[PDB]
Structure 1
């Protein structure tokens, strides 16, 4: 599923991500924009053999099981395929674990490089939320 901008903002809010760990909804929408262009089915292979899955491109090294990432963990206790669903519940619940892990949203390199410090409220501007 390819979410609309405001549509994803609303779904994220619905699942309690707005201001989770102090990160405003715009931060999450921004991260999702540059990680997946709002596409739940986005996947990308990393040089190290792990794979990133879903709207927030959650990585199989630590967070989900895809059966093909040697030495990895599955700390969200989910198959990585669950992160590709049209229903964003699994991605949101797993992202809550990730952003609580110590470095906040810097865990998402694209958030640090393209969202951090910018006018992230622009991403939810105009949205009925």
Structure 2
């Protein structure tokens, strides 16, 4: 599913990400924009042989199981495929564990490089929330 900007903001809010670990909704919408362009079915293979899954490009090295990432963990306890669902619950539940891990939203490299420090509230401007 390719979410609209405001549609994803609302879903993220409903799923408890708004100010989760102090990160405002615009931060999460911005990270989803640049990670996946709002497409839940986004996948991208990394050089280390792990793969990034879903709206927030959650990686199989630590977070989910895809069966093809040697030495990897599955700390979200989910198949990586659950991260591609039109329903974002699995992705949000996993992102909450990731943003809790110590480095906050820096764990999403596109967030650090493209969202961090910017006017992230722009990402929710206009939206009925």
> Do both share a fold (TM > 0.5)?
yes
Taking the aligned partners of 1:23 and 1:76, their CA distance within structure 2 comes to 20
* Residue 71 of structure 2: aligned partner: 71
Give the SS at the match of 2:56.
coil
Point out where structure 2 has 5 or more consecutive residues left out of the alignment. Answer: none
Q: CA RMSD in A?
A: 0.2
Q: Deviations over 1:8-48 (max 9, x none)?
A: 00000000000000000000000000000000000000000
Measured in 2, the distance between the counterparts of 1:83 and 1:71 equals 20
Distance 2:65 2:109 in 1: 21
Report the alpha carbon displacement of residue 60 of structure 1 after superposing the two structures with TM.
Answer: 0.1
Q: 1:65-101 CA deviation, whole Å, 9 max, x = no partner?
A: 0000000000000000000000000000000000000
4+ residue runs over 3 A deviation: none
TM (norm. structure 1) is: 1.00
Structure 1 residues not aligned, in runs of 5+: none
TM-score w.r.t. the length of structure 2 is: 1.00
Q: Distance in 2 between matches of 1:62 and 1:116?
A: 23
